[PDB]
Ligand binder design. Structure first.
Ligand SMILES: [K+]
Ligand SMILES: [K+]
Ligand SMILES: [K+]
Ligand SMILES: [K+]
Ligand SMILES: [K+]
Ligand SMILES: [K+]
Ligand SMILES: [K+]
Ligand SMILES: [K+]
Ligand SMILES: [K+]
Ligand SMILES: [Mg+2]
Ligand SMILES: [Mg+2]
Ligand SMILES: [Mg+2]
Ligand SMILES: [Mg+2]
Ligand SMILES: [Mg+2]
Ligand SMILES: [Mg+2]
Ligand SMILES: [Mg+2]
Ligand SMILES: [Mg+2]
Ligand SMILES: [Mg+2]
Ligand SMILES: [Mg+2]
Ligand SMILES: [Mg+2]
Ligand SMILES: [Mg+2]
Ligand SMILES: [Mg+2]
Ligand SMILES: [Mg+2]
Ligand SMILES: [Mg+2]
Ligand SMILES: [Mg+2]
Ligand SMILES: [Mg+2]
Ligand SMILES: [Mg+2]
Ligand SMILES: [Mg+2]
Ligand SMILES: [Mg+2]
Ligand SMILES: [Mg+2]
Ligand SMILES: [Mg+2]
Ligand SMILES: [Mg+2]
Ligand SMILES: [Mg+2]
Ligand SMILES: [Mg+2]
Ligand SMILES: [Mg+2]
Ligand SMILES: [Mg+2]
Ligand SMILES: [Mg+2]
Ligand SMILES: [Mg+2]
Ligand SMILES: [Mg+2]
Ligand SMILES: [Mg+2]
Ligand SMILES: [Mg+2]
Ligand SMILES: [Mg+2]
Ligand SMILES: [Mg+2]
Ligand SMILES: [Mg+2]
Ligand SMILES: [Mg+2]
Ligand SMILES: [Mg+2]
Ligand SMILES: [Mg+2]
Ligand SMILES: [Mg+2]
Ligand SMILES: [Mg+2]
Ligand SMILES: [Mg+2]
Ligand SMILES: [Mg+2]
Ligand SMILES: [Mg+2]
Ligand SMILES: [Mg+2]
Ligand SMILES: [Mg+2]
Ligand SMILES: [Mg+2]
Ligand SMILES: [Mg+2]
Ligand SMILES: [Mg+2]
Ligand SMILES: [Mg+2]
Ligand SMILES: [Mg+2]
Ligand SMILES: [Mg+2]
Ligand SMILES: [Mg+2]
Ligand SMILES: [Mg+2]
Ligand SMILES: [Mg+2]
Ligand SMILES: [Mg+2]
Ligand SMILES: [Mg+2]
Ligand SMILES: [Mg+2]
Ligand SMILES: [Mg+2]
Ligand SMILES: [Mg+2]
Ligand SMILES: [Mg+2]
Ligand SMILES: [Mg+2]
Ligand SMILES: [Mg+2]
Ligand SMILES: [Mg+2]
Ligand SMILES: [Mg+2]
Ligand SMILES: [Mg+2]
Ligand SMILES: [Mg+2]
Ligand SMILES: [Mg+2]
Ligand SMILES: [Mg+2]
Ligand SMILES: [Mg+2]
Ligand SMILES: [Zn+2]
Lengths: 208, 124, 138, 83, 104, 150
RNA sequence: GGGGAUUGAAAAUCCC
RNA sequence: UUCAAA
RNA sequence: GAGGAAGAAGCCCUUCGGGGUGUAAACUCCUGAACCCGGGACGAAACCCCCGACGAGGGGACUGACGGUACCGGGGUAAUAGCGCCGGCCAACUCCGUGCCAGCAGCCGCGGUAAUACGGAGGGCGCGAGCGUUACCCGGAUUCACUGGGCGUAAAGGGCGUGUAGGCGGCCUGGGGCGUCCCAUGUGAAAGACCACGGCUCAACCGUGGGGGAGCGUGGGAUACGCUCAGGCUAGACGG
RNA sequence: GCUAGUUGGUGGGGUAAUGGCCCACCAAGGCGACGACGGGUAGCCGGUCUGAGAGGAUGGCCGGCCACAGGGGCACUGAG
């Protein structure tokens, strides 16, 4: 089961703020806000020049932790990326960005990814009409991701979909806040995203 | 060598010598203790490593190591062997798997329990 | 006795160039002459010419180098940095057009001998033929 | 004798047959002489039945004896339709 | 097609049968070098026609006996014991390598 | 302007009565990630001073790497002593496939795609020097052209 | 079989 | 004499 | 799942000021694995019968082990977490306990009173219904080097010669076309692998379609190099 | 170093059919350092794992071929 445990601690081990909570991570409290040092009894102690390896490990752990995906699944995507034509780095990101659970989150249907995930597992999500509770489901270009008719009235749904009014969204995505529909226009360009991650090191980590 | 020589003699392929010849290159092998001596290490170590001679089912009679803090092995304890040398005791190439057969698991063990065959203790 | 006249020529050239000779003779043979044509046209050697020495037919090979250099060791760069024999007596080497090698992403060459004559890897590739991969030069 | 019958491909609870020509004596999913079509029982695709009728007509011309089911499918593709 | 091989007659000591040495040439599967290799076929000569030293063609045929599965198709080049000689010598060297040895 | 990547630091020893007497050696690469790299090996009583000395040496002893879209103009092999280095060009997406020593020199040279292989003695010092020489030996079509003209 | 003396701790040596 | 001590 | 303290208690550490576990928990609010109720499959349309002519073609009927399963619709509970590591290689450090003991150890090595290496604890790293161990194969190993290694002193030139087989063979011309090269053509089962679409909500799994050729056979063609047969040449060798 | 049905021939026998497959006579011949004979191990392949590749390793599952049916021999029946 995708991690599930103290999360605003991973932010602390990566020395960078990851959004694994949506809000709370915006209001002075993602911990990174005054307490940016690693978790644990030695968190405040001076760090030692990390090994080329350490650097590469933490980088992958960053990107991977951002999407709350497992090593098993993360690796399988990367291997797929390698094989495919074109720059593995971007292509990899493109694939991570195509996970239904992620897209749900991108469209704002949920505040964080872990929430977006649950929304999927519980059928509150629809792809071209049909229900789909597979958070790893790969959204293709042209697919319409909406909210289940029966779920459109849920308290949590309104709140999030409300806050989405006026809010802009991914240049590769499009949100019709009305009927609570969204459309995966195209695979995001590396230029499209802006994750605190140097995918180049990630490729290197697996090249070892 | 010349190509003609290579055509004539060719290169010889490397053959691998097994380090755990306790036959059938099986993953483990069971046996019966014959002696449960204690032995002394080679320089620069000193201590009384626990060891046992095992009359193996592979038709072999080798000496295996008894890992962990204390054991319960005697002149007739049936045990399972796994292979793994004891760098300090020349001639000791296998370990005895604690937790299988007559080999009790280490008691009061709390960390590396898989090894030493120690069941998960209860937390009241 | 020379076991490989072509290898001999290739070396005579390799040797002369490492000490910056002007020319350098090599006992003449049509086949050697053929390779020199390529070498010349490709621009590795200024050019070559038939010459009689002691009554015997040779081939003056006029080598060429780069310009004098700066700092310690002003000795010019070699135009012919590398020149290695591939196919040899007792270990002959052939290639089909599809197996002709790409010597230094093209910045170099490979002289093969095809039934359509001695050609550079590019020339051969063009006429779509393969043959004995004689040497590589760069 | 030689026959025209279904060879089973696909997976568990997901059959996908192959209209094939083969010796009556060969194991069902063994080496066939020729593939002349395919058939999907659950018709999970609009293209669940195809049959190289020209070829089917060929083997029949030389002796291939079709299974009852094999015959059924051939008919659908108008193999015997002599209109 | 019925395989046709060319070789040398290195034995006419049988009734209606000749031994034909056939050389083969090919690149070594790993080392490249073109290498030779030979094999002797017992060919059928019912007319006791061909003799020691002839270069005949041999053709794949209906078994004539055990060993014999080739018939002499024709003569390519008559007389030339140089080849036979080579074979005979190589065979004589054998008399050497063993428990004793033969003169070189 | 110039980046600094420390390849390795070591503490050698010499002998005098009384005992050992340490010294420190530092291998530092300097580069602009745009075709310019330099190697430096400096030794001194203290590490810090050694590193600096290295960096300083690194700046003299620079090499003009002819990058071609993140890669090398062609493949090359160079032996420095018993150490050999194999540099092979690659298409984008490949990355810098190399041992710590070569990559450090390769990345600061502004190389982003390359196939590498360390042969013979993998003595870092010499492997680094083999690398510099390899790069230094790289030629461009224009260059070859210039040479072959006359 | 310690328990001391000695040892950095031992072996050894001298003590009970 | 053993192991280890700058 | 979201919210949730400048941050409970407990345990750990402390320079006794404080620091960790830690938004983690508690608690609030959402969702609703399990489970209950209802519906409930595809896979099965032939053989056969009737019309027609036992044909083509039309009609008709009987069949589901899986399974009341899958799937669908209602209702609906906060609801398993382990295992291995933290001296270097190798991501992760502190206290206490033990003393060359008890023990660890893949390799280098740890332990003879301050042990990040033993055992425990707190903390941390890694992975997660799995995590480790053993065994075995390829890799790293250009460490048998075809690609891709060596032999003065590191392992390695035979004590020397004569010479058999074999391997290797200078310059020019011609015939042949065996090697070699080029073009067609046959063969190269299916599955697998690769690419592209598809079917199970995804995937695993599966279906359809698409290149991909090496090897060998056949038929043409080329002749630089190697080969072979002819004839020449003196610069190798031999002789006077 | 090996070989006497051993190698070959003529004529028979036998088979769906070639053949020392078997037999009767007649020849002395066949094979080997390009590894005969002997010993050890092993079912082969499509393929599988690994590897940048060349290679290396492997042949469970599925597909093809072969061999066997407690261990040895033999035939009868039959398109087999
Ligand atoms: K050199
Ligand atoms: K009908
Ligand atoms: K203590
Ligand atoms: K510890
Ligand atoms: K290995
Ligand atoms: K010697
Ligand atoms: K000719
Ligand atoms: K007969
Ligand atoms: K194989
Ligand atoms: Mg890629
Ligand atoms: Mg080899
Ligand atoms: Mg064993
Ligand atoms: Mg010790
Ligand atoms: Mg341990
Ligand atoms: Mg040469
Ligand atoms: Mg050269
Ligand atoms: Mg070569
Ligand atoms: Mg080669
Ligand atoms: Mg005769
Ligand atoms: Mg006969
Ligand atoms: Mg130094
Ligand atoms: Mg330049
Ligand atoms: Mg170079
Ligand atoms: Mg060297
Ligand atoms: Mg080495
Ligand atoms: Mg002392
Ligand atoms: Mg003494
Ligand atoms: Mg000691
Ligand atoms: Mg929470
Ligand atoms: Mg409720
Ligand atoms: Mg049905
Ligand atoms: Mg029935
Ligand atoms: Mg009727
Ligand atoms: Mg329901
Ligand atoms: Mg429901
Ligand atoms: Mg409710
Ligand atoms: Mg570390
Ligand atoms: Mg202590
Ligand atoms: Mg450790
Ligand atoms: Mg799982
Ligand atoms: Mg690797
Ligand atoms: Mg190897
Ligand atoms: Mg080795
Ligand atoms: Mg070699
Ligand atoms: Mg070596
Ligand atoms: Mg010596
Ligand atoms: Mg020596
Ligand atoms: Mg000598
Ligand atoms: Mg010649
Ligand atoms: Mg010759
Ligand atoms: Mg000729
Ligand atoms: Mg030819
Ligand atoms: Mg073909
Ligand atoms: Mg196929
Ligand atoms: Mg799909
Ligand atoms: Mg296919
Ligand atoms: Mg001609
Ligand atoms: Mg040739
Ligand atoms: Mg014999
Ligand atoms: Mg007869
Ligand atoms: Mg007959
Ligand atoms: Mg016989
Ligand atoms: Mg024999
Ligand atoms: Mg032979
Ligand atoms: Mg015998
Ligand atoms: Mg044998
Ligand atoms: Mg067997
Ligand atoms: Mg078998
Ligand atoms: Mg390799
Ligand atoms: Mg095999
Ligand atoms: Mg099989
Ligand atoms: Mg039997
Ligand atoms: Mg049988
Ligand atoms: Mg039997
Ligand atoms: Mg039985
Ligand atoms: Mg029986
Ligand atoms: Mg019958
Ligand atoms: Mg019968
Ligand atoms: Zn956070």
């Amino acid at each position: 089961g995708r991690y599930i445990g103290p999360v605003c601690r991973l932010c602390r081990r990566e020395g960078v703020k990851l959004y694994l909570k949506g809000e709370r991570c915006y209001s002075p409290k993602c911990a990174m806000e005054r307490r940016p040092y690693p978790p644990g009894q030695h968190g405040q102690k001076r760090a030692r020049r990390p090994s080329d390896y350490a650097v590469r490990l933490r980088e992958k752990q960053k990107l991977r932790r951002i999407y709350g995906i497992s090593e098993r699944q993360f690796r399988n995507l990367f291997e797929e990326a390698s094989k495919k034509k074109g720059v593995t780095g971007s292509v990899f990101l493109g694939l991570l960005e195509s996970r239904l659970d992620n897209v749900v989150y991108r469209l704002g249907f949920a505040v964080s990814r872990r929430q977006a995930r649950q929304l999927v597992r519980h059928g509150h999500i629809t792809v071209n009409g049909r229900r789909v509770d597979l958070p790893s489901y790969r959204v293709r270009p042209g697919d319409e991701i909406a909210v289940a008719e029966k779920s459109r009235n849920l308290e949590l749904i309104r709140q999030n979909l409300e806050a989405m009014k006026g809010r802009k969204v991914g240049p590769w995505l499009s949100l019709d806040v009305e009927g609570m529909k969204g459309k995966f226009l195209r695979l995001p360009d590396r230029e499209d995203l802006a994750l605190p991650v140097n995918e180049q090191l990630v490729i290197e980590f697996y090249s070892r | 060598p010349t190509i003609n020589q290579l055509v004539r003699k060719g290169r010889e392929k490397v053959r691998k010598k097994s380090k755990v010849p306790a036959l059938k290159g099986a993953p483990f092998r069971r046996g019966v203790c014959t002696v449960v001596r204690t032995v002394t290490p080679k320089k620069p170590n000193s201590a009384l490593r626990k060891v046992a001679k095992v009359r193996l089912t592979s038709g072999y009679e080798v000496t295996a190591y008894i890992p962990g803090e204390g054991h319960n092995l005697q002149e007739h304890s049936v045990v399972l062997i796994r292979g793994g040398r004891v760098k300090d005791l020349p001639g000791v190439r296998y370990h005895i798997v604690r937790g299988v057969y007559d080999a009790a698991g280490v008691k009061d063990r709390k960390k590396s329990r898989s090894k030493y065959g120690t069941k998960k203790p209860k937390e009241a | 006795m020379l076991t490989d006249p072509i290898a001999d020529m290739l070396t005579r050239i390799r040797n002369a160039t490492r000490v910056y000779k002007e020319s350098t003779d090599v006992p003449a043979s049509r086949f050697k002459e053929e390779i020199l044509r390529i070498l010349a046209r490709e621009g590795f050697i200024k050019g070559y010419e038939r010459v009689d020495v002691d009554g015997k037919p040779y081939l003056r090979v006029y080598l060429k180098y780069g310009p004098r250099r700066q700092g310690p060791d002003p000795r010019p760069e070699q135009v012919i940095h590398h020149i290695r024999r591939i196919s040899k007596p007792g270990r002959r080497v052939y290639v089909g057009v599809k197996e002709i090698p790409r010597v230094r992403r093209g910045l170099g060459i490979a002289i093969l001998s095809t039934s359509k004559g001695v050609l550079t890897d590019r020339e051969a590739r063009k006429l779509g033929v393969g043959g004995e991969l004689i040497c590589e030069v760069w | 004798m030689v026959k025209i019958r279904l060879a089973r491909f696909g997976s568990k609870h997901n059959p996908h047959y192959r209209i094939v020509v083969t010796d009556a004596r060969r194991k069902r999913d063994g080496k066939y002489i020729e593939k002349i079509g395919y058939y999907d029982p659950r018709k999970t695709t609009p293209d669940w039945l195809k049959v190289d009728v020209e070829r089917a007509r060929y083997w029949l011309s030389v002796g291939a004896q079709p299974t009852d089911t094999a015959r059924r499918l051939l008919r659908q593709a108008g193999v015997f339709r002599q209109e | 097609p019925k395989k046709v091989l060319t070789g040398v007659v290195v034995s006419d000591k049988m009734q209606k049968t000749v031994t034909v040495l056939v050389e083969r040439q090919f690149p070594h599967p790993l080392y490249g070098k073109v290498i030779k290799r030979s094999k002797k076929y017992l060919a059928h000569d019912p007319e006791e026609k061909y003799k020691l030293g002839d270069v005949v063609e041999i053709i794949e045929s209906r078994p004539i006996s055990k060993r014999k599965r080739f018939r002499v198709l024709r003569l390519v080049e008559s007389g030339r014991m140089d080849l036979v000689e080579k074979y005979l010598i190589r065979r004589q060297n054998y008399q050497s390598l063993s428990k004793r040895g033969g003169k070189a | 302007d110039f980046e600094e990547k420390m390849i390795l630091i070591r503490r050698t020893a010499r002998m005098q009565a009384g005992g050992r007497r340490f010294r420190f050696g530092a291998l530092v690469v300097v580069g602009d990630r745009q075709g310019r790299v330099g190697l430096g090996f400096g030794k001194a009583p203290e590490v810090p001073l050694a590193v600096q000395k290295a960096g300083y040496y690194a700046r003299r002893n620079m090499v003009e790497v002819p990058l071609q879209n993140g890669t090398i103009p062609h493949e090359i092999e160079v032996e420095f002593g018993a150490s050999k280095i194999v540099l092979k060009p690659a298409a984008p997406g490949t990355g810098v496939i190399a041992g710590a020593v070569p990559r450090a020199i390769l990345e600061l040279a502004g190389v982003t795609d390359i196939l590498t292989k360390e042969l013979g003695s993998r003595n870092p010092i010499n492997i680094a020097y083999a690398t510099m020489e390899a790069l230094r030996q790289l030629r461009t079509k224009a260059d070859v052209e210039r040479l072959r003209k006359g």
